[PDB]
Ligand SMILES: *[C@@H]1O[C@H](CO)[C@@H](O[C@@H]2O[C@H](CO)[C@@H](O[C@@H]3O[C@H](CO)[C@@H](O)[C@H](O[C@H]4O[C@H](CO)[C@@H](O)[C@H](O)[C@@H]4O)[C@@H]3O)[C@H](O)[C@H]2NC(C)=O)[C@H](O)[C@H]1NC(C)=O
Ligand SMILES: *[C@@H]1O[C@H](CO)[C@@H](O[C@@H]2O[C@H](CO)[C@@H](O)[C@H](O)[C@H]2NC(C)=O)[C@H](O)[C@H]1NC(C)=O
């Protein structure tokens with residue numbers, strides 16, 4: 001009577017510690033009631049692995065907590081999927097990427113910053129790369145016991161500002177800021193446990209002798225970063241000079257040398273030399289230029305920004321009934337950036353068609369069933385289902 | 392007879408850097424008949440006199456900056472761009488731009504970082520130098536807890552466990568657990584004061600045994616970077632990425648069409664060490680966009696690097712001297728080298744003639760035209776000049 005439709009579809013990424021474990025739930029409607037079958041991305045069904053992987057009584061895929069020595073890649077590092085099958089047909093859920101992580105101790109270091117008097121600075125929380133995925137800055141702390149907290153930047157005024165990217169920004173540092181030592185608290189997403197940095201960083205304020213031209217922390221005149229739509233993005237410009245330089249941001253026109261001055265508003269803001277883009281959208285993508293001038297001279301560093309958007313898929317029509325021999329057409333309406341590939345499936349099998357529109361010119365008894373459109377990134381996947389009825 | 396305009400025998404270098412304690416002396420010498428007078432000037436053409444205890448003109452033509460206390464630093468003296476003026480009755484010539492930079496010595500400490508590495512792949516160890524001494528301080532040698540000294544190599548032979556790169560960082564092939572049993576210290580040497588200093592912090596290699604497999608991961612999320620290099624110098628393009636199983640890496644160089652790319656040809660000159668590309672004895676033609684591609688069974692990643700190779704500026708005028716009979720044609724051809732070239736300009740007895748073309752032609756030689764001529768090639772960071780004389784018959 002009716003094909004399967006996912007009511008609750010597992011997320012693309014499931015990350016958990018070996019201590020917590022995880023349980024993945026998948027549910028779908030239909031008439032008759034579809035059966036839920038957990039599978040790998042390649043389509044094979046998954047069974048119980050003692051102490052490691054279990055199919056629950058309610059149809060949930062479970063990974064109970066386990067010893068680090070019991071780690072298996074075939075289970076814990078595997079990409080899974082949910083299969084909802086019916087007499088009418090079957091559908092496959094978007095890729096479920098399971099990563100079980102054995103929790104391993106780490107140390108964060110707060111770096112010192114050597115500053116020319118009057119220039120603004122940004123303090124970094126150094127996080128070892130192996131925990132870099134699961135660890136972020138909780139807050140900043142100083143020797144006198146003052147707390148600086150992360151905020152979506154509604155108000156950029158004030159001396160100390162914690163950037164959305166986790167660094168601690170400080171306006172116009174004088175000698176009076178040199179008596180403080182700064183420390184950063186890190187938070188682990190999986191364990192929820194907090195840890196202070198092993199090393200306290202502190203500002204070294206050097207009084208300017210003579211004049212100095214703009215000088216960046218690095219000699220690299222170009223870089224890039226990735227960002228999410230609807231998330232607050234930070235473009236850093238790190239330069240020190242005396243007399244204190246002024247910074248302006250420009251945006252190049254696509255495939256052109258020409259560029260426009262970035263317009264600053266209640267969403268796009270500039271804190272000293274740093275640029276913050278709140279509530280980012282895909283169109284913010286492009287090539288940006290930071291220009292730093294002072295009386296003695298000037299420099300320019302470049303940045304390439306790419307703003308990602310979540311993948312979504314919709315098939316028009318959701319349902320259609322065609323007669324034997326007549327054409328049947330499916331149009332996949334998808335969104336999100338970037339898009340690497342489009343692909344189609346029928347009742348859980350690759351149809352070998354990469355175009356957003358799928359058309360069966362002469363329909364047979366075989367073609368009846370559920371159809372799916374799959375859009376994917378390296379990072380992501382999305383799925384939409386549609387049903388085809390005969391007569 | 393034997394009468395000739397000025398020509399520089401010794402032209403002071405483009406960059407003069409010295410510590411407040413050491414001091415400096417800049418000497419400019421030029422020939423001529425009669426003996427030319429040497430006069431020190433600024434870039435604007437104004438003459439400079441003696442500033443007591445700070446700047447002094449020696450009558451033999453030396454510009455002297457005796458040692459001074461940090462309190463005595465003057466922007467108008469120590470940070471100034473100078474030039475040498477050699478004048479005679481026939482004309483005058485101005486030397487290349489001389490950038491004088493005096494530096495008050497600041498105490499510093501370099502950090503030898505501990506680096507986390509997955510077993511089996513290569514690692515490069517950073518020596519952090521405070522950005523304010525970054526100009527004047529470089530890595531002299533590496534030293535380890537066992538007392539083994541590693542010295543910077545020209546990269547003649549890149550085989551072997553340990554290779555100190557031209558840039559000063561320490562590269563290590565196929566790190567095993569045993570390579571983490573020891574701790575490393577880098578020794579930095581200050582260029583101006585000649586003093587050597589230990590890192591005072593010993594970095595240690597942490598070898599983490601792989602739990603499952605992981606795709607290529609770079610130290611930073613940046614997919615692009617650029618760097619500058621000088622001709623004849625050994626240039627290092629770093630690719631620092633970890634994966635398990637240990638990944639294989641490929642270097643490419645984009646075509647000027649920018650769509651196409653070619654595999655980098657490895658030879659006795661251009662050679663890569665386990666993912667780190669070294670270009671020895673660099674030339675201008677090595678410039679371009681490079682791509683480091685790290686692919687593995689689990690996945691792949693590619694980082695881009697834009698390299699620019701600079702060559703020193705030099706200028707020479709084809710005739711050094713010529714004598715015209717008032718026959719109307721007269722010609723000077725400026726031979727210049729180096730990269731990049733921002734501007735070419737001709738000067739007459741120390742003043743711009745408003746001609747930027749490499750070949751200066753004076754049609755209609757007249758008594759107004761007698762004097763010294765100069766070709767001037769400039770980039771932002773350097774300058775060069777050539778001298779020539781014009782005589783009448
Ligand atoms: C998930 O994996 C992690 C490892 O990746 C695992 O955490 C580790 O558990 C072991 C226990 O099996 C811990 O060992 C302890 O270490 C502390 C020091 O940190 C010791 O003080 C403890 O004392 C023990 O020693 C006695 C004998 O010497 C025992 O008889 C006594 O009962 C105590 O157990 C003990 O040695 C280890 O520290 C942690 N490591 C980390 C980083 O947390 C975790 O248990 C795994 N989770 C599950 C659910 O299996
Ligand atoms: C600020 O400094 C910049 C240099 O970073 C100056 O602009 C550059 O000038 C050079 C020529 O020397 C050009 O090749 C660049 O294309 C210019 N870049 C830009 C972004 O303009 C600029 O003139 C300086 N501005 C002031 C007011 O001094």
Ligand SMILES: *[C@@H]1O[C@H](CO)[C@@H](O[C@@H]2O[C@H](CO)[C@@H](O)[C@H](O)[C@H]2NC(C)=O)[C@H](O)[C@H]1NC(C)=O
Nearest residue numbers: 410411412413458459460461462495496497498
């Ligand atoms: C050059 O400047 C440095 C300061 O940067 C001077 O070194 C100082 O010397 C005094 C003694 O006269 C010491 O008490 C300080 O600790 C030193 N400071 C540093 C940073 O070394 C040095 O004397 C100056 N040189 C001359 C010739 O005066």
Ligand SMILES: *[C@@H]1O[C@H](CO)[C@@H](O[C@@H]2O[C@H](CO)[C@@H](O)[C@H](O)[C@H]2NC(C)=O)[C@H](O)[C@H]1NC(C)=O
Nearest residue numbers: 340641683684685686687688690691692693694
């Ligand atoms: C090596 O890695 C690259 C990605 O770093 C793989 O994919 C290439 O990705 C680009 C997109 O940036 C596509 O345009 C190319 O077509 C992809 N390459 C191919 C061959 O399709 C690449 O596939 C990897 N190569 C191998 C042999 O694994």
